[PDB]
Design a protein around this ligand. Sequence first.
Ligand SMILES: C/C=C/Cn1c(Cc2cc(OC)c(OC)c(OC)c2)nc2c(N)ncnc21
Length: 209
Amino acid sequence: EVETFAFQAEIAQLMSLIINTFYSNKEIFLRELISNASDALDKIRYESLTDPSKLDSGKELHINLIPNKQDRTLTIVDTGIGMTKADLINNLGTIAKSGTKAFMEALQAGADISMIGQFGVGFYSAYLVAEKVTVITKHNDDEQYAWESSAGGSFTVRTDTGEPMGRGTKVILHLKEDQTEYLEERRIKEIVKKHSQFIGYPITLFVEK
Ligand SMILES: C/C=C/Cn1c(Cc2cc(OC)c(OC)c(OC)c2)nc2c(N)ncnc21
């Protein structure tokens, strides 16, 4: 049972800008997605101090980076707070509308795409390198969902019947044909060292079989 939704026009416009603008410094996507994972881990850690049972779904707080050359995917996995169905359909986008407007204005004033994270819409930097993004996510007291979008103005949400995650989020980047460098161990290591070397959770870079 797959539900299809339209992005708000402002968010669709942002996605088109990210896809269409000439901008060579694409590697910043990884810092943004790792920071999102870190934020999610911070949140479940903080909530667990007043309600320890929130970690019944898993105590380990960490990030995995998983390249797969056969599938042409780079997956960023965290065991953070996860996202609810309400997040995926309504609430993240409602918040994102103002950040998108501010980001657009900053760009017109001379900012560049690498500053996208300051506006709360760094997630969408995924589309610098991915033709499709699939997000599998599980929040306590909600179901496991798959969100997906290839841009073009729409996204889908379905209940996920794949392998149960416990709690957290997998961001699966289906890479563009000319962006397979982000499947290489040396390249990912370089980017993590340059931009994400003080993240306060273990980051395990898997190697390709
Ligand atoms: C400021 C938004 C936080 C939501 N979030 C994102 C980024 C994100 C995911 C989203 O959906 C998967 C978004 O809406 C499409 C979105 O809109 C700005 C942002 N990653 C994660 C993550 N790993 N774990 C828990 N929450 C997350």
